[PDB]
A and B are shown apart, each in its own frame.
Chain A
Amino acid sequence: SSTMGQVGRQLAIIGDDINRRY
């Protein structure tokens, strides 16, 4: 993403996806 905080929040979103699928 544009900034590292943006990157971290995108990873939070991906982690929630993982938590919902596995």
Chain B
Amino acid sequence: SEEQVAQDTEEVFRSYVFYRHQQEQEAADPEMVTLPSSTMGQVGRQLAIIGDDINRRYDSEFQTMLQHLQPTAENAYEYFTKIATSLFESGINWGRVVALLGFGYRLALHVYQHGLTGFLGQVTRFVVDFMLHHSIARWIAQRGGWVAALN
């Protein structure tokens, strides 16, 4: 069930994006307020909690990051792919998965803030396909699926 984990990743990332944006309002991108009590939704919400903590602790790194994301978004795929590949060249663990989720969230948010609309689906596809082709889905399957993140 590697392919099962890969398909689940879409809903996990969508729920993560929704809840991270929602709690960032409790302190904007309309596209992140739509289209979500399933297992994967709950996993996304939990991961969004820990990701918000991390985004506050590493704000400057995540902002500096986006200097390589062109303001037109013409290199979105290149930027995402290269950064995530460097992220996982040294191995896989749950923390690094959560970091990838937060990276995708900030990329999707920033491309909207630069005036490119309707791109959240593509960042979701970026995340799903990367996790599939970089053995992240197989790893998560080997630890019991996305549901194992609830521990």
Q: What's the least CB distance linking A11 to chain B, in Å?
A: 5
**A16 pairs with B95, CB closer than 8 A:** yes
**Interface Cβ pair total, 8 Å cutoff:** 79
Per-residue CB proximity of B75-91 to A under 8 Å, as 1/0? 00001001111111110
Secondary structure at the B interface, as helix, strand, loop or mixed, is helix
Among residues of A, the one whose C-beta sits closest to the C-beta of B97 is A15
**A8 pairs with B95, CB closer than 8 A:** no
Among residues of B, the one whose C-beta sits closest to the C-beta of A1 is B64
**A4 pairs with B68, CB closer than 8 A:** yes
Binding site for A on B (CB under 8 A): 50, 54, 58, 61, 64-65, 68, 79, 82-90, 93-100, 103
Per-residue CB proximity of A1-22 to B under 8 Å, as 1/0? 1001111111110111111101
A9, A19, A22: most-surrounded residue (chain B CB, <10 A) = A22
CA distance A12 to B93 in the complex (A): 10
**B95 pairs with A1, CB closer than 8 A:** no
Secondary structure at the A interface, as helix, strand, loop or mixed, is helix
**B58 pairs with A14, CB closer than 8 A:** yes
Report A-chain residues with C-beta under 8 Å of the C-beta of B94.
18-19, 22
Report B-chain residues with C-beta under 8 Å of the C-beta of A15.
87, 93, 95-100
**B95 pairs with A18, CB closer than 8 A:** yes
List 11 interface pairs A-B (beta carbons < 8 Å), by A numbering: A7-B83, A7-B86, A8-B88, A11-B84, A12-B99, A15-B87, A15-B97, A15-B99, A17-B95, A18-B94, A22-B95
CA distance A4 to B97 in the complex (A): 18
